Amino acid sequence: MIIYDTPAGPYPARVRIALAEKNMLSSVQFVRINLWKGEHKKPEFLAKNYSGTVPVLELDDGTLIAECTAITEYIDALDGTPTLTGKTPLEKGVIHMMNKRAELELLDPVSVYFHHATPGLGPEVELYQNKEWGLRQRDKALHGMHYFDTVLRERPYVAGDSFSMADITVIAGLIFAAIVKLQVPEECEALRAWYKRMQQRPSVKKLL
Amino acid sequence: MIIYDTPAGPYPARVRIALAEKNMLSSVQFVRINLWKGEHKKPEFLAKNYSGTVPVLELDDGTLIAECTAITEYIDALDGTPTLTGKTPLEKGVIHMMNKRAELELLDPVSVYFHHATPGLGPEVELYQNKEWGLRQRDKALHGMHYFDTVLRERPYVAGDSFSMADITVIAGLIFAAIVKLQVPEECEALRAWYKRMQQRPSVKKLL
Structure with missing residues (x-):
């Protein structure tokens, strides 16, 4: 491969x-x-x-x-x-929901913020940029962090009792947030604790 | 349920x-x-x-x-x-790729165009609108139609020889395009022929 x-x-x-x-x-x-x-x-x-x-x-x-x-x-x-993707119908359903939600509410918005409201990959690569859209996506990402904090106050991994694709998506979201210095709020203690664990895998x- | x-x-x-x-x-x-x-x-x-x-x-x-x-x-x-979602590793991989690509390149952009560059659900629902972003998403959708036309010139369904989740996503994309009167170009004959078939299921x- x-x-x-x-x-x-x-x-x-x-x-x-x-x-x-x-x-x-x-x-x-x-x-x-x-x-x-x-x-x-x-x-x-x-x-x-x-x-x-x-x-x-x-x-x-x-x-x-x-x-x-x-x-x-x-x-x-x-x-x-x-x-990573689920054995039972329930697991597949819940892991895909949380995976899609991590894309929509955290990862993609950080990415959009990167490419549209910062220099991103530079002016020759970023041929069209919409700052105002990029900035709203930043706020969307921050809200996503608060959402994922509320999940992780109830379950040890993003989709429940076991590690899944959805944890990887949130991980990539936090990696990208770090690249653009979008800070995880202090008060997001469950998201912070989970990430610290993830960092050990x-x-x-x-x-x- | x-x-x-x-x-x-x-x-x-x-x-x-x-x-x-x-x-x-x-x-x-x-x-x-x-x-x-x-x-x-x-x-x-x-x-x-x-x-x-x-x-x-x-x-x-x-x-x-x-x-x-x-x-x-x-x-x-x-x-x-x-x-709809695939039996073999290959099928799951290809159906999910095409499903995600139909979301990214056709359906979501039509939706974004609806909510941002038309009245959408109205001013009380559409509290923030970014016309210029909405309009670029319209053009993205049109390009998506041309992409899906090139696929359907080689295969009878979106992900290959059998009907899948990915055909349903393109179907929903064309349904939404019709709602906002975003016309499928005349020259997209394979996309048009496929849709006409889909319309018979x-x-x-x-x-x-």
Whole structure:
């Protein structure tokens, strides 16, 4: 298997962490995509991924699977024993809800804030920027932190009693927040305590 | 099972279609959420779904599962024989990629265009609107139509040889496009031919 990404990318982080959680890092050849050069917006890469994002998984027969959720679902199912995406109908439902909610309410908004209300990847890459939209997305992310704090006051991991894809998405959200210096509020003690734990997992600790 | 939605909502459409595809419509009690009154943004509903969107599934024991992808994953897994979300690791990977891409490149942008660059649900509901962002999302949706036309020139359904969750997402995208009169370009003949087929499926034909 081939992964096209950048090592320090918060979105690439979601797949690299899941790969380590599945003991599959060695089954993967990583190919560097040069985000600082806008390689993700050039025709060669767009042929790999219309949406122009990393990471992208390339299977041995040439098959391309893009998007963090799709890649995680693929690799989790490989060994026939899913540990990140859910065994029962309930687990799949709850993990996907929380995973989607982490994307919508924390990760994507931080990303939008990065690309639109800061210099982001620079003026040659960031050809259109909408500051005001970017800034509202920042506030959305902050509210997301408070939401995830209320979850983690009741459950030890984002989707309940076990670690899942959804924890990885929140982890990537906090990694991106740190990049743009969007501070987790002091009062979000459960989110802070959970993150401190997450920071100790081998899959995460390695990546960081 | 209980579904909280509005019958004519394109997002509710994704779950209602999947329910019909699974022969489960009768297992469901639908409760009307009054979008025109901003009921989705009031505290009672927000307690059901922080993100403030329909549909939401309520299980008999009170469990709440929100978000179209999560609900579809739950109901598809119920009878133990998944027909919408994939059996093999490849199928799950490809269906989730195309499903996410339909959200990102077609459905969500149409929705953003609706709520931000038209009157949407009205001034009392649409408290903040960013026209310019809404209009760029319209163009993004149009490009999405051209992307999905290129897919459907090579495969009979969005994720390949069989109908999936990803076709339902594109269907909901085209339903929403029709609501805001965003025209599918004449030249998108494969997208048009596929939709015309989709329009004949019992699950869809019923809904419409």
